[PDB]
Design a protein around this ligand. Structure first.
Ligand SMILES: Nc1ncnc2c1ncn2[C@@H]1O[C@H](COP(=O)(O)OP(=O)(O)NP(=O)(O)O)[C@@H](O)[C@H]1O
Ligand SMILES: Nc1ncnc2c1ncn2[C@@H]1O[C@H](COP(=O)(O)OP(=O)(O)NP(=O)(O)O)[C@@H](O)[C@H]1O
Ligand SMILES: [Mg+2]
Ligand SMILES: [Mg+2]
Lengths: 75, 527, 527
């Protein structure tokens, strides 16, 4: 969406390319075409992807069951 | 006190009004489209999937946004009047043309040339749709059309297919609310009207409350029968034949009627008298239709034959009649099987010109009475709220089935507009702005298929690309089945809609949307 | 409670009111002018390009700005009544005269002398326009005028050109809404009226609901026919001739009519009876027209001829009469050419006075009924919204075509006013303030051409300069074709408009704008 494309259209085609071409196929946002990400060099550390989803789910779960908020009255 | 707004501000108001109306209607499109509950001031709210019903209720506070909404409501209203189905498709098409037209105008295109370009494209598109049109072969397509228009309801499709066969090519089908929870089809053949049973003593079968007569003589007399001195001479001669006698008159009162009932009880004659159907001029034609069917001549005040002067020479005849508490049925005249064809031709020649005059099926009812029959589909449900929506779907499928017979059927699911829009690639015009109008119609024609996919949870642009490529790899009839979510041949699968509905929807959508695009200023009263 | 404002404050209010009204109308000027959507309280909004329609709706909250708007609305209203076209041009001219007049007054000029100078200039301009006028040669100019007035629509131009030929010089053309999507032209020649068919038994063409008589006798008698004693003598002698008989009266009741129908069924005579058209005073003139056309005489109440004593001597005659459900037509007795000519001469003499008093314009139809024919153009469109706009354009082209025949045609596109404004250079007056009034008209006459260029996306002053110089290099008929955006001969290209429209527009605009300039104080109620 940030690059100027429809997000759901891109997602749907990336899902299709997961079995037509391979698991590593995705959408390149620098130039608007689909290609193999690993060969193109568009790769991320697997620690980043692992920690991000784990951290995000932890804070989200904490706020989903939060029952009270205590804060000082601003004068 | 008026206020006038111009240019982009004017078009911004119109776009907002059109969008807000179209967004409400478009949720009902497709087999997975959902329904809209409309508040009624007094009573139960109305739950409906009908596109025109939702559109008719929409109104907005902003006078300029309301102007856009009221113009697009004409698209749904005209489509319902002409075809009875496709009102949601027409509304979706109208928004697409208007939205794309504003983009072209914002780039500097001439609004009048865009309308001229739009008109040329619609002429080509309508021609292409007629090419794809396939005539209805018989019951198979009739059931398929009824099922699709009833929102994929096979039970409704079966009933309407039966009703079409019963009344034939020239019959009429009427939809009413059943007093019970069951939905039934009722068919009657031949002449019948809403009068009869002047006296309860005219009984032939006390178990069922009717007055069946075998080979009766039918007395068609316009004015009142109120004396013995004139009824008796006609009674003096029917006794000689021994056949039963039926009286159609303005009103038989105590003195006149007492003669027959006393005579009927004694068994010297078996006879009954009924009220004359209709009022005013509606009296004149009806007994004329009865007279021609029975083989006799109606005894009008115009004819110049007094009641006592009648005889068997012009007295009408029939094979069997049924008269009950509120209905009289004539099942066969046994005559004039050649004259009625001339009468039939005379009727529809008047019907088409009197289409501007009639507001009820009585114009076609008389034609349907003598040339075919009528079928009454009584829709029933466990609840009034469910019954209202079920009855609306039945009426839509009845109208679509009638439209399919007139102009054939076409591939459904929006495929026909997609296939027709392909020919717009070859249509070139000399004016650059008129070319933009052609391109607007090409995008608009491909919008309904995307909205059907969107309502079904699929991506419209992905579905549209596959349907476009399947047109050459597989065939023109191949499309997307939104009910189950896979591509197949629409005509073989039975996902078809009438050619008339598709043609009417695009023509009405373009005429209104093209007109609005030429606007530059809006004049509305200050609230 | 009133409030009075003076001087520059008063003129500021008037200028604001005039500008706000003129800015809305002027967007519809030219071949590339755009339309205006007008809010209607009940029903669909109206989309129109007609100048007077937009002006009639404008009204403002400020009491003093409204006074300026209401005065200029008279310019468009008067032009529509007199010419039926050029309302937008008249409004544009009125604003130009008023705006330039305020500048002259602000410099210290005498307001009354400016009006006197304006009047002198308009007299010269009107004289120049009549010099440029070219009489209509025939169909070529008629079809060109109709096309231009219909916003460059050749389909409408062809229909109106055919209608003019069918009804001739003295015919009348009527525009109606068609019940279908097609636009058709219907022409009937000879006498006809909205009555007939007192009984269905007079059928001569059952395939068409038509009562047809060849060389019939026409009976014109005022009162009712209500007995056999008086009806018999007229029947007792038409049988001897053997020709068909036609009855015109207010009514024929049952005892009287049953005589002919029982006689018509047996074929001793072939006749039909119809009700006399019209009501009240409006009876005698039509029957007198019918009687004079048939070569007989009308049995009149004042005449005193008893129905029994009539004979074949004064019984009218025709060649062919056709009777249907609601209409009867008489082809013509081709007699009394001079006698009808007196009525033709008299009716048009009455028309010029009775047009201010009659309830309907059907007095013109009375002229056309016995001297020419009528043509009905039934405009049709896919939707009501498009039909309303299309019908308005047809009406404008019909009015412009009629105006062209009266006073000839003139170069279009605003060229005629530009050419006429050239003669104002030679018009000198002794009063300095009156000279400013002449200069105001010169600038005003050149404003419509600049607005047409502006609506088409070109600079008005650049176009005006080229058109001014092309008058010397090429000719007076050369102008700017805003449709395609190049300069050419307007008369050869067919871009022409009637002389009457141009003459009326400048005269109406100057009369109102000149009167307004003399104002010094405005009296209005406090809200
Ligand atoms: N199973 C299906 N798969 C795909 N398209 C379908 C299917 N069933 C129906 N359609 C299409 O969906 C449309 C019918 O939806 P519907 O809600 O009746 O629209 P409408 O007729 O424009 N509106 P209304 O006047 O409310 O009936 C047509 O274009 C049908 O061809
Ligand atoms: N193709 C053209 N090129 C240039 N001028 C044209 C062309 N077509 C028409 N005109 C001129 O444009 C004017 C007609 O525009 P129109 O919108 O009909 O103005 P009007 O007649 O003053 N108002 P209305 O009452 O709305 O018809 C006339 O002066 C025509 O001569
Ligand atoms: Mg439908
Ligand atoms: Mg005009």
């Amino acid at each position: 969406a940030n690059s100027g494309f429809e997000g759901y259209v891109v997602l749907e085609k990336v899902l299709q390319l997961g079995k037509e071409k391979g698991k590593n196929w995705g959408f390149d946002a620098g130039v608007g075409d689909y290609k193999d990400m690993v060969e193109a060099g568009i790769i991320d550390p697997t620690k980043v992807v692992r920690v991000a989803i784990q951290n995000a789910a932890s804070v989200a779960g904490t706020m989903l069951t939060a029952e009270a908020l205590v804060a000082e009255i601003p004068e | 006190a008026k206020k006038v707004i111009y240019g982009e501000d004017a078009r911004a108001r119109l776009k907002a009004g059109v969008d807000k109306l179209a967004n409400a209607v478009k949720v009902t499109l497709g087999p997975r489209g959902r329904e809209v509950i409309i508040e009624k001031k007094w009573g139960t709210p109305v739950v409906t999937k009908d596109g025109v019903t939702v559109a008719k209720e929409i109104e907005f506070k902003d006078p300029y946004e309301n102007m856009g909404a009221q113009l697009v409501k004409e698209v749904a209203s005209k489509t319902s009047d002409v075809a009875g189905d496709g009102t949601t498709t027409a509304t979706v098409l109208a928004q697409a043309i208007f939205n794309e037209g504003l983009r072209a105008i914002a780039s500097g295109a001439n609004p009048m040339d865009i309308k001229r370009g739009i008109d040329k494209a619609v002429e080509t598109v309508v021609n292409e749709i007629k090419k794809l049109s396939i005539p209805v072969s018989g019951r198979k397509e009739i059931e398929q059309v009824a099922t699709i228009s009833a929102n994929n309801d096979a039970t409704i499709g079966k009933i309407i297919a039966d009703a079409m066969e019963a009344v034939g090519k020239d019959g009429v089908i009427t939809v009413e609310e059943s007093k019970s929870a069951e939905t039934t089809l009722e068919t009657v053949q031949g002449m019948q009207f809403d009068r009869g049973y002047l006296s309860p003593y005219f009984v032939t079968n006390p178990d069922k409350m009717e007055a069946v007569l075998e080979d009766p003589f039918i007395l068609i007399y316009e004015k009142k029968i109120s004396n013995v001195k004139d009824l008796l001479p006609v009674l003096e001669n029917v006794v000689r034949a021994g056949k039963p006698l039926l009286i159609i008159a303005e009103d038989v009162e105590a003195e006149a009627l007492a003669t027959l009932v006393v005579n009927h009880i004694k068994g010297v004659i078996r006879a009954c008298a009924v009220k004359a159907p209709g009022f005013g001029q509606r009296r004149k034609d009806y007994l004329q239709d009865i007279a021609i069917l029975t083989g006799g001549t109606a005894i009008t005040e115009e004819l110049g034959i007094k009641l006592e002067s009648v005889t068997l020479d012009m007295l009408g005849r029939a094979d069997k009649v049924i008269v009950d508490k509120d209905n009289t049925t004539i099942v066969g005249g046994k005559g004039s099987k050649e004259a009625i064809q001339a009468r039939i031709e005379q009727i529809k020649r008047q019907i088409l010109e009197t289409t501007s005059d009639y507001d009820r099926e009585k114009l076609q009812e008389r034609l349907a009475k003598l040339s075919g029959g009528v079928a009454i589909i009584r829709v029933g449900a466990a609840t009034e709220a469910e019954l209202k929506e079920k009855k609306a779907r039945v009426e839509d499928a009845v109208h679509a089935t009638k439209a399919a017979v007139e102009e054939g059927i076409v591939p459904g699911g929006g495929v026909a507009l997609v296939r027709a829009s392909e020919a717009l690639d070859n249509l070139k015009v000399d004016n650059a702005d008129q070319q933009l109008g052609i391109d607007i119609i090409k995008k608009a024609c491909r919008t309904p298929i995307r909205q059907i996919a969107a309502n079904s949870g699929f991506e419209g642009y992905v579905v549209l690309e596959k349907v476009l490529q399947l047109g050459k790899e597989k065939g023109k009839n191949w499309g997307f089945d939104a009910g189950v979510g896979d591509y197949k041949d629409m005509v073989e699968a039975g996902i078809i809609d009438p050619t008339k509905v598709v043609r009417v929807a695009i023509q009405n959508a373009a005429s209104v949307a093209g007109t609005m695009l030429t606007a530059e200023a809006l004049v509305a009263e200050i609230p």
